[PDB]
Every structure is written in structure tokens, then in C-alpha cells.
Design a protein around this ligand. Structure first.
Ligand SMILES: Nc1ncnc2c1ncn2[C@@H]1O[C@H](COP(=O)(O)OP(=O)(O)OP(=O)(O)O)[C@@H](O)[C@H]1O
Ligand SMILES: [Mg+2]
Ligand SMILES: [Mg+2]
Lengths: 582, 240, 113, 120
């Protein structure tokens, strides 16, 4: 615990030791803000604090202002004091502060800072004799002449305190080229409150992904349609990828070469067979050995962390990776995948760095030709795998992927899926290519698909739209996948309009997913980018709502969803604050 | 007519919708259930209106003779048309019946469901699917008994329901018989569930908004109006 | 508007500070408009003038609310109605307090479903 | 390990295979039946070894309230995958539940069944 102390001292400097000795329990860090006047005597405090090396101490000087005389001097002093208070604040703790030192203007500015940014306990010190030496004040406190007065307890504005990320790139606020960004903070909060209290139409609401404290200029920027130049901002924006296949990462390039050792913007329609053959260099024929599989997992996790993705669900085929000849069962392969993902997550978390939580989905591969017991085997494997319990990474769902044609609709194995539904395991369907509304309907209502894949043609089935919107089941709409396979506007010969915009207007919980990064050659960031020309008139607010839908649709426990929501809200606020200025 | 005449003068109007109760073994033959469902779907088919028919209801006496796993085949058509079902799977009903109501009837709400705390898997799926759980504080307190009831040991589970993450909503059931409207129903939570917070009450209101059967656009307008009104009331609440 | 008055020579007699303002010696320092809280004044209705009083009837009405501001994750980010973020912090921590019987007025004014 | 140790020294060794009991658990969060079935299926799917899982067994709470005419739909996956089925029923049950076990669960063994002499 770092009981950081902040103070300001004028002609009298010995008050800071009085503040330190006011609480006999003892502080840990003490900092003093003072101007560059010559009346200060830092030597007494320096030698007093040198007698206790275990307590950190530092001195900051406000250069150029001997004393506050005019409006500019006071505003510069206030800006510097606010910057110092917000830069010396503990990362996860409200610091203490004593107002006794300094003249009235410093005292008022310091109290204002404490109110804005929060403090554990603001207090005062009162000296009956006003000592000038350590010995006399020591005698006074031994007798009982020491007096400490405490009046306030301020939480401050969390939004204001989350602003310290913009402190750098200012060189230290030199008066020649200084912009009082803390005054920008105060005008932001004042304008937001005044606008909220002086209107009703604006004061309706607006941002459901939660924020509402950004400067009004930032909100206007958000409401504007997103352009192709927002790539840096959106890459800095954390994302969620609920549909990503492990076996389609290192399908080509140096990544494939290095995993073997141990496009991406097409304008012609590609059949599914060619898309599957594009990744034929990896998967069943290659990942049988343990080394290649481990390398694939580590590379995928590294790419996900690089792309700032904060959560993802991975679909992998344990049976396609098993090797009975080398005693590599499907269960062993899945155990290896879970163990390496857990190891990577723990390694990333232990260093207090951004990490990407990943959960696996067992894909019930569609064969419909031979060994039809494979589906039951996959279901049993998934149930036993989720029954592990322990581990940050676990099994949360089963994917009903494969050839979604009429031959393998949802009216085949529902009695079998009774078993998976009994054990509290989620089910994800896939009925998005070459399917009838009837198939989607009883896939929703018999398979009890808590999440739906693709389903690009819901526009022509209003009853299906009402069913999906009312039941709040998601949609795994993949922009680049249908761009390459189906194709939409404004590509040549492709006059069809992408239903993503209309899906958002209707209210479907659409989640943009990357499908296969390796095969498509485009990551989730490019997946969100392509919406600028794929769906004209799309705005950044809709992108934020897409992220909210993705986080609200994933198969996670309520507590983990709460933690993810907290982190995502904080990070989105921080990145928006950083990006609006630059 | 009441809603339109209240809105024309630009006052506070309570938008209201109807639920068609389909009781079990209440009047004799069970063909009355089919008649009720047919009437409900035909009524919803009106198309244009302000006070519409959101869905149907499933209510019974206690159990067995009024179980929730008897009328799936009858319910297929009405549930396919586009209505909604709020099964009364609760009030000393075994967890199997609640499971049938959730997974075969596709019921979007459960009445009371006070004893849900003893079925961890049923809980888990309820929170995982955000199935609304309507609970009546005063009614259940009167007809079942919860602390601080004299000579009683059990206590109301609403606090744990909210902590777990169930989309709980507070209701009134029968105003006249119980003698308590929504205001005192919510107020009694202070002495019924100790430690309940005001933000918890606001989340209860939010959940009540969430689990209601309304269109997306109407839900958005209702949410905006509720948020603005909520901000005004908490602005002028700390006054007292 | 809360502000400060600073005088270089700290005048005592009225003519001195008058002459000071004639030139402009007295400068004006303010930190900005303070909305405060939009509604807290029913304390003066519930608490009468109390002209006859002493230290015995000291009212700590808000101090315990101030004490319980941070002394006390779900309650942190369970925030619905995003405009509640704009709401000033004191009433936010007020909402964080446990419910009580004497909140019937707020409950009745509360829009419900 | 015990079987291999006994066989290496060329002594007399008793080959041992395991039966996964599917306890009835009258209510008992009845998803445990599906959990047991999945565990048995994947245990057999492990494949390589000397000792192996050969089948499942259902028993416990033998009264008519827990007869074999309930879970006849859950036993499709276990039976298609390749396992074997056993059904303990007949100590004090009716002579029809045995027929249900034989012709519905496809049970290849009948535990006890001491009252078979009264149903020709
Ligand atoms: N569920 C989570 N998912 C991802 N990261 C998390 C999660 N929970 C905690 N963290 C990490 O906690 C750390 C807290 O960091 P902090 O609040 O000090 O902000 P920061 O260090 O200035 O910037 P950054 O958030 O990028 O680290 C974050 O880095 C974040 O990566
Ligand atoms: Mg896919
Ligand atoms: Mg009722």
C-alpha cells in the first residue's frame, strides 16, 4: 500500500514534516509542489527525509512563476498543479493531501484538484506555536500542541482520473508552446453537464456501449460516418472474435514455412472447395505431430495479442488432428491445445501485460457419408472436455459446421443434442449458405442454437427476423468471407447490398468475425475496415455497438462477462480520449 | 382510447399491453386451452393498434394436474406465429417442469421460481439464456413466508438472484388482494432482502425493460425516455 | 461563480482600494462556473431555522454519506442507463448506499415497469 | 501396469476390464447420466492399452419409479459408438421392464432377474 502524500508549501516548508507526523502510522511517498521562488528552503526537508530513507520523497518546481500575480500566472500554476497531481497519483489508490501549506490561491487550487480527481482523505495541520525547526515541532507534538483537522472525503470523477494517458507528447508544458489540456478536461466536463441539464432531446441517451463523458466534439466525431483513414484508431480499439478456426492460420507464407520447420482483397467469387484447398497445406496432413500444433497455437495467440483482440472463441477439430499410430488420440490433442493456451494466457497475465482470453469450441464436423458415429463421439468428447472445470481456458460450446445444405439440416440429431443441452453446454449452428428459412427456423427452435452462423438472407423472411430479434440470438456475419465467396457492393458484377447495415437497424445482435485469417489474408481490423465501402454510411457508433453485441453474445459466465465489460469500457474510453486529440 | 387521450394532452401515460391467460383444468375440458390460444393469435393478427397483444400465459394451481409439459403440440402453432410464452413454472414446482418449460415450450419468462436456488444446472442455463423471472415480493411473502416473518427461518432469495445475474423483475400480481402496488412492493425489499442497494433497484428496472416483449424500436424509445426520467429523478432525489 | 480577489498592497482604507481599482491593481481569479448538485436544498425545508441551538443538535446528515463514499465489481459496473455517468459523484455514491424504508418518496417518483 | 507386471514374469495374471456404472440418481441432477455416457464413450475412444472399457451398466434404486422405460432415447450414442449395454433389472421388478431393457436398450446382459421363471 502506497500512502502517497501531496502538498504545496510557500514561505513555510516545515509543515510537510508536520503532515507526515500528523498520522503516527506513517506514510510511504511524499511529494511537494512549489514554485521557483528563492524564499524556499528545501535543505531542511531534504535532511529530515534523508533520516528515513525507507520513505520516498521528491521535489517538483514550477518554473517561470515566482508568484501568482495575474490571470495568466494563476492559470499556468493551476495547470501545472493539476498535471503534477494527476501524474503523481497512485495507479490504483486515492492519495492523501494536506492543504495547510501555500497561500490561499494554492490552497483553493489544490482543493479543487482533490475534488476533481479524488483523494482518500484531505486534511489540515494546525500549529499553536508555528515552529520553524524539527526539534520545536517534535516537542510540540510530544506535548500535544500538534493539531490536525480533517474535513473532506472526495471520490472525484473516474472519467477525469482516467485521462493521465494523454500526459506525454508535451515535452513538459513549456510556456512558449503549452496547451492547457487539463483546462480542456474541465471544459469537457462542464460542457457535458451543462448540455445534459439544458436540453432534453440531446439528453435522451445515445451511447449504449456506455461512456457519455467524452467531450461533445468527440461525440460528434463518433456520430460521423467512419472513413477509410480510421485504421489507426480502430486498431487501437480492442475487438472480439467469436468465430475463428485454428486450422486456417498458417495456410501460406513465412508463417506456414516456420510452422512446417518446427488476395487478400479479391474481386472474383471463389467457390468453397477452392477456399478449403487454399488451406490444404496445413491441418490434417501437417498438424498430426505435436510440434507443428504447438507452434500453430503459439503463433495464433501471438497474432491475436498483436491485433489487440481481448477475447476470442476458437473452433478446432480434435479428431482431424489425432494420430492413433503415434498414440495421439483426439482427447490428447484437445488436452494439449487447452494446456498450451492456458500456459500462454498465464505467461501473458503474470507480466501484467495485455492478454487475449481464448476459449475453444468443438466443431461437430459434418460427414453424412461414413462413420456417422463420429458426431456422437465428438459430442461426448466435448462434454468430457468441458467437465475439466479448472483452467482459465475451457470449453464453452459446440459448432454445428460443415455442409449446411438440405442433406444435413437440423431435423436429424436433435434427440442427440438433448444430451449436450442437459449438461449446460452452448450450441452454435451454421445455416448461412444455400439454405431456406425453414431450415434456419427449426435450427433455432429444435437445435436451440444460442448463436447463429452467417444467415445472410434473413432479409426475405420477416417472420425469421422477428424470431431472431425477439429471442436475442446472435449472428456470425463475416464480411471478408462473403466478400470473397459471395461478393457485394461496390465490386464489379456485384450490385448486391450488404445486409449488415439493415441488420444493425433491425436490432440483430450482429458480430463481425474473421472466419479464417490465414485463408482470407485479412484480420479482424481489416474485417471492420472493409465496412467503409461495403456498407456506405456506416458510423463509428455502429462499430462500437457491434463490439457490444459481440461481447454480449459470447458464451461466458455472468461474472466473466462483467469483468470483460469493465475492461472494455475503460479501454474504449481511454483510446477515444487518446485519439480525439491526435 | 385511454392511452391516446392521455397522450394527446401531453401528460404522463402508461403504455400497456395484454397477456392472454391460458389456465389449466380451470373450467373443465382442456379444449379451452386451444380456444384461448386461437383467440390470442387471432387478436394479435389485428395488425394496426397501440395497445397490442404481446403473447400468451400459462398458469396452473400447484403441480401435476397443472404441469407445464402437457401442451407442447398445442403450443407449436401459436408459438410459431410470433407470440411469446410466460410459463408459471414455480411456486413449489420441481426443476424438471421448469426445464420442460424453458427448453420445450421456449418460455421467455418464469413465474416466481422461488426455489431455483437448489438447481445449479437450471440456474446456470437460466442466466446463460437471460430468461426473465417475474417475482412478486408481497404476494410470495404473504402466501409462502420469508424473514423477518415470525416463526420463520427461510429468507427471500432475490439478492442472490441478482448477484448471480438472473434477469429478475419485480411485479405486483394482484394489487387488490395483496393490497400493495409497485412502489411499496419495491420498498419492502429493504426489510425483505437486507443490504439491497439503490443501483440494484435501477438494474431491476433495467431488467424489467429488458425482458418485456416489445419491438426493437419501441424498446429503444422506451429506454431513452426511461434513462432521461431516471436521471431527472436521481438529480432531484438527493434533495430530500 | 466562485472566485478570488488579490491585492498587491492589501489596502486597508477604502480610498486606497478605490484608487487601486482605478488603475486596475485588484485582479480577478476564478476557476469556472460550478453547477454543484442540481437539487440538495430540501435540507433547509426539513431542518428549520433553528435560531435557538447549540453544539448538542449537530446534524451529520451528509457526512455519513461522505464517509460511505469509498469506505464500503458488480456494484461498480452494474451501471444501467448510460446517462447516469454524467450524474455528479455524490449522488452516485448515494445510489451505492443500501436501500432504506425512508426512500418511499424516491420510490414513488421512480419510473417503473 | 499390474497386468503387464504380472505377465512379464510369466505368472498367472487376471485380465481385468472396467464397467462404467451409470447410477440411476432418481433425480440427482439427472444430467449425470449423459455425463457418464460421454465419459464412457471417450474412455473407449482412448483405444490403445491392455485393460479397456467394454460397456456401461445401469442400476440403483431398483423400485418401479426408476424402471428402464425412461432413458431409452439417451442410449443411442453409446450404442452406435460401439459400447456394450447392461441393464440390472428383475430382482423385484415387473416382467415387462425386462422386455423393455432387452428390446429397447439392446442390453446384452440381465443383472439378477431371479423372477424370470414366472414369465414363460
Ligand atoms: N479481462 C482482461 N482482458 C485483457 N486485459 C486485462 C483484463 N483484465 C485486466 N487486464 C489488464 O489490466 C491491466 C491494467 O492496466 P492499467 O489499468 O494500469 O492501464 P495502463 O497500464 O495505463 O494501460 P493498459 O490497459 O493498456 O495496460 C491492463 O493492461 C489489462 O491488459
Ligand atoms: Mg467458419
Ligand atoms: Mg400470477
Amino acid at each position: 500500500m502506497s500512502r502517497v502524500l501531496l502538498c504545496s508549501a510557500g514561505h513555510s516548508s516545515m509543515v510537510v514534516p508536520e503532515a507526515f507526523h500528523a498520522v503516527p502510522e506513517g506514510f510511504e511517498e511524499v511529494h511537494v509542489f512549489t514554485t521557483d521562488s528563492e524564499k524556499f528552503n528545501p535543505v531542511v526537508l531534504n535532511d529530515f527525509f534523508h533520516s528515513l530513507p525507507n520513505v520516498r520523497f521528491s521535489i517538483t518546481k514550477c518554473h517561470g512563476l515566482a508568484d501568482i500575480l495575474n490571470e495568466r500566472d494563476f492559470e499556468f500554476y493551476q495547470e501545472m498543479l493539476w498535471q503534477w497531481y494527476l501524474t503523481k497519483m497512485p495507479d490504483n489508490e486515492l492519495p492523501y493531501v494536506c492543504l495547510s501549506g501555500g497561500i490561499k490561491s494554492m490552497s483553493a487550487s489544490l482543493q479543487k484538484a482533490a475534488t476533481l480527481f479524488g483523494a482518500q482523505s484531505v486534511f489540515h495541520v494546525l500549529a499553536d506555536n508555528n515552529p520553524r525547526n524539527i526539534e520545536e515541532m517534535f516537542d510540540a507534538l510530544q506535548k500535544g500542541q500538534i493539531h490536525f483537522i480533517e474535513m473532506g472525503y472526495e471520490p472525484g470523477w473516474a472519467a477525469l482520473r482516467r485521462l493521465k494517458k494523454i500526459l506525454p507528447i508535451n515535452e513538459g508544458c513549456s510556456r512558449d508552446n503549452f496547451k492547457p489540456l487539463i483546462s480542456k478536461s474541465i471544459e469537457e466536463i462542464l460542457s457535458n453537464v451543462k448540455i445534459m441539464a439544458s436540453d432534453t432531446g440531446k439528453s435522451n441517451q445515445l451511447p449504449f456501449p456506455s461512456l457519455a463523458i467524452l467531450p461533445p466534439i468527440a461525440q460528434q466525431w463518433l456520430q460521423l460516418p467512419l472513413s477509410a483513414n480510421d485504421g489507426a484508431w480502430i486498431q487501437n480499439l480492442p475487438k472480439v472474435d467469436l468465430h475463428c478456426h485454428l486450422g486456417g492460420f498458417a495456410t501460406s507464407g513465412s508463417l506456414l514455412d516456420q510452422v512446417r520447420g518446427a488476395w487478400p482483397r479479391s474481386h472474383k467469387s471463389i467457390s468453397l472447395d477452392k477456399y478449403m484447398e487454399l488451406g490444404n497445406a496445413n491441418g490434417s496432413k501437417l498438424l498430426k505431430d505435436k510440434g507443428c500444433l504447438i507452434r500453430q497455437v503459439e503463433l495464433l495467440y501471438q497474432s491475436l495479442v498483436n491485433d489487440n483482440v481481448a477475447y476470442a472463441e476458437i473452433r478446432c477439430s480434435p479428431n482431424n488432428y489425432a494420430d492413433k499410430n503415434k498414440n495421439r488420440s483426439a482427447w490428447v490433442v484437445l488436452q494439449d491445445i487447452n494446456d498450451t493456451f492456458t500456459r500462454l494466457i498465464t505467461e501473458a497475465k503474470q507480466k501484467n501485460q495485455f492478454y487475449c482470453h481464448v476459449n475453444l469450441l468443438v466443431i461437430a464436423s459434418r460427414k453424412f457419408s461414413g462413420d456417422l458415429s463420429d458426431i456422437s463421439k465428438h459430442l461426448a468428447l466435448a462434454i468430457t472436455a468441458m467437465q475439466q472445470g479448472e483452467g482459465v481456458c475451457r470449453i464453452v460450446g459446440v459448432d454445428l459446421a460443415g455442409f449446411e445444405n438440405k442433406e444435413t439440416r437440423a431435423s436429424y440429431y436433435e434427440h442427440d443434442f438433448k444430451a449436450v443441452h442437459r449438461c449446460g453446454l452452448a450450441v452454435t449452428a451454421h445455416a448461412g449458405e444455400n439454405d431456406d428459412p425453414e431450415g434456419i427456423w427449426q435450427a433455432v427452435y429444435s437445435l436451440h442454437a444460442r448463436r447463429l452462423g452467417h444467415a445472410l438472407n434473413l432479409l426475405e423472411a420477416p417472420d425469421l427476423m422477428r424470431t431472431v430479434i425477439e429471442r436475442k440470438i446472435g449472428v456470425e456475419m463475416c464480411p471478408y468471407a462473403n466478400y470473397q465467396i459471395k461478393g457485394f457492393a461496390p465490386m464489379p458484377n456485384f450490385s448486391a447490398l450488404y445486409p449488415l447495415k439493415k441488420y444493425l437497424e433491425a436490432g440483430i445482435l450482429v458480430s463481425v468475425n474473421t472466419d479464417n485469417i490465414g485463408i482470407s489474408g485479412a484480420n479482424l481490423s481489416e474485417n471492420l475496415l472493409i465496412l467503409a465501402d461495403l456498407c456506405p454510411g456506416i458510423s463509428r457508433m455502429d462499430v462500437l455497438t457491434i463490439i457490444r453485441n459481440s461481447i454480449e453474445t459470447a458464451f461466458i459466465s455472468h461474472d466473466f462477462r462483467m469483468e470483460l465489460l469493465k475492461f472494455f469500457d475503460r479501454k474504449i474510453y481511454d483510446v477515444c480520449l487518446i485519439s480525439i486529440k491526435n
